Every structure is written in C-alpha cells, then in structure tokens.
Structure 1
Amino acid sequence: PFDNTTYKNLQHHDYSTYTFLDLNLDLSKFRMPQPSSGRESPRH
C-alpha cells in the first residue's frame, strides 16, 4: 500500500549522545587502510 501521510523518519527520536561515535566505531572495520605521509606528524 502507498503511504504518503506518515513521517517515516522516526529513528532519531531514539538516538543517544554516543550514537554517531558508536556508528563510527562500527564503521571502522569496513574501511580501506589509510594513506601515510611517511612521518608520524609534521613535527617529526
């Protein structure tokens, strides 16, 4: 059935203070290995 009368974006009523960072921690395993500049920092 086609519904155009309800607001389907009700998930953000349940987001806590660490939702973004827990999502980033979950996404940390899916990602490519980072490029390196060859030094540990620009002060190295």
Structure 2
Amino acid sequence: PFDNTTYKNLQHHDYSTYTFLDLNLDLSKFRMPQPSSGRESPRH
C-alpha cells in the first residue's frame, strides 16, 4: 500500500559508536585494489 504518514528512517535510533567503522570493515571486502605511488610514504 501507499503510506505518507510515518517516518521510515527509524534505523539510526539503534546505531552504536562503532556503526560507521564496522560498516567500513564490512565494505573492505568489496573494494577494488588501491593504486600505489611506488613508495611507502613521501618520506621514503
């Protein structure tokens, strides 16, 4: 049915302090391999 009376974004009431970082850790398996500049750091 159609509903325009309730607020469907109730998920963020249950987010903890590690929600963002656990989501990033979950996303880490999906991602493309990073490019490299050829050195370990600009001080190398």
Question: What is the number of residues matched between the two proteins?
Answer: 44
Shift of 1:23: 0.1
Give 1:13 shift: 0.1
The TM-score with structure 2 as length reference comes to: 0.99
Gap regions ≥5 residues in structure 2: none
Q: Which whole-Å CA distance do the structure 2 matches of 1:2 and 1:28 have between them?
A: 36
The gaps in structure 1 that reach 5 residues or longer are: none
Alpha carbon RMSD of aligned pairs, Å? 0.2
Q: State the match for 1:23 in structure 2.
A: 23
Query: Distance in 1 between the 2:24 and 2:4 partners?
Result: 32
Cα deviation for residue 3 of structure 1 reads: 0.1
Query: Which consecutive aligned stretches of 4+ in structure 1 deviate over 3 angstroms post-superposition?
Result: none
| Shift of residue 34, structure 1, vs aligned partner | 0.1
Q: Distance in 1 between matches of 2:20 and 2:2?
A: 32
